[PDB]
């Protein structure tokens, strides 16, 4: 199976992970928030939590969200790429 090594930024912390390169983002986001939170908790950092209603997304440096329905590969996210896990509140 193909994999991508990505850097995830969450709460000013970088976390390296190995992710399936072919799955849609949609099926990785909630799973990734849980691994993230495990790492933050070991660092005694407050886990990431849903301010009200809204959507967790993986974002480029400029705020651009990945498409939920496409893979990392299809979106040109490769080894060493960095993504920000961000919550968008619905207001």
Commentary on this structure:
A four-stranded mixed beta sheet has the order 2-1-4-3, covered by helices on one side. By secondary structure, it is α+β, with helices and mostly antiparallel strands. It has a single domain, classed as Roll (Ubiquitin-like (UB roll)), CATH 3.10.20.90. 15% of the residues lie in helices and 33% in strands.
What proportion strand?
25-35%
CATH topology title = Ubiquitin-like (UB roll)
Oligomeric state of shown chains = monomer
Q: What's the number of structural domains?
A: 1
CATH architecture: Roll
- Distance between the ends: 40 Å
Specify Rg, calculated over alpha carbons.
13 Å
Task: Write out the strand line-up for the largest beta sheet, numbering strands in chain order.
Answer: 2-1-4-3
Level-1 CATH class name? Alpha Beta
Overall, the morphology is globular
Number of helical stretches of at least 4 residues: 1
CATH superfamily: Phosphatidylinositol 3-kinase Catalytic Subunit, Chain A, domain 1
Biggest sheet character: 4 strands, mixed
Helix content: 10-25%
List the secondary-structure elements in sequence, H or E. EEHEE
Class based on secondary structure composition and strand pairing: alpha+beta
Total strand segments: 4
What are the salient characteristics of this protein?
monomeric, ubiqutin-like cytosolic ESX secretion, 4-stranded mixed sheet, membrane protein, 91 residues, alpha+beta, Ubiquitin-like (UB roll)
């Amino acid at each position: 199976p193909q994999a991508a090594v990505v850097a995830i930024m969450a709460a000013d912390v970088q976390i390296a992970v190995v992710l399936d390169a072919h799955a849609p983002i949609s099926v990785m986001i909630d799973p990734l928030l849980k691994v993230v939170n495990t790492r933050l908790r070991e660092l005694g950092v407050a886990p990431l939590e849903a301010k009200g209603r809204g959507r967790w997304m993986l974002c480029l440096v400029d705020g651009t969200p990945l498409r939920p329905n496409l893979s990392l590969t299809e979106q040109e996210v490769y080894d060493g790429d960095r993504l920000w896990l961000k919550f968008l509140e619905d207001t």
